[PDB]
């Protein structure tokens, strides 16, 4: 159990609409890891004073609000579409497949 190869731990996951403010992004580990510590640093400097940090933190806040309102709008649209497609009925999962048996398999 203690010797099973070269390991690698768990990291930070990023909220995609506020990282790369508005515009679409791509994946890279170093950039996301930079952004997570960068915005905590800019928050501390903006609280201490420092108008250049206050600009960056306010711009991030603007993108954060816009993405959050867009995503709740998408939730409302999906709920309305589901209430149109089915009635007051709900969607039902597939049953689990256990393989063959000497039984009628929908018993």
């Amino acid at each position: 159990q203690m010797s099973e190869g070269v390991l690698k731990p768990e990291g930070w996951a990023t909220m995609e609409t506020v990282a790369g403010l508005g515009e679409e992004v791509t994946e890279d580990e170093g950039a996301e890891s930079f952004n997570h510590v960068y915005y905590r640093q800019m928050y501390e400097l903006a609280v201490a004073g420092d108008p250049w940090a206050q600009r960056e933190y306010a711009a991030m806040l603007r993108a954060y609000d816009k993405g959050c309102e867009s995503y709740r709008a998408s939730y409302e649209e999906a709920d309305v579409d589901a209430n149109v497609e089915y009635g007051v009925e709900s969607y039902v999962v597939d049953p689990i497949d256990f393989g063959p048996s000497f039984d009628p398999e929908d018993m």
């Binding site: 790369g20 515009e23 679409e24 992004v25 791509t26 890279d28 400097l45 960056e56």
Partner: peptide, 27 residues
């Protein structure tokens, strides 16, 4: 006085702009 804080803000802001920007990397 006050020089290292200004240089720190300028350096991490430039490092955010021209490196470590995922929209830049996407384009």
């Amino acid at each position: 006085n006050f020089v290292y804080s200004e240089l720190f803000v300028k350096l991490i802001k430039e490092c955010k702009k021209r490196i470590h920007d995922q929209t830049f990397l996407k384009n």
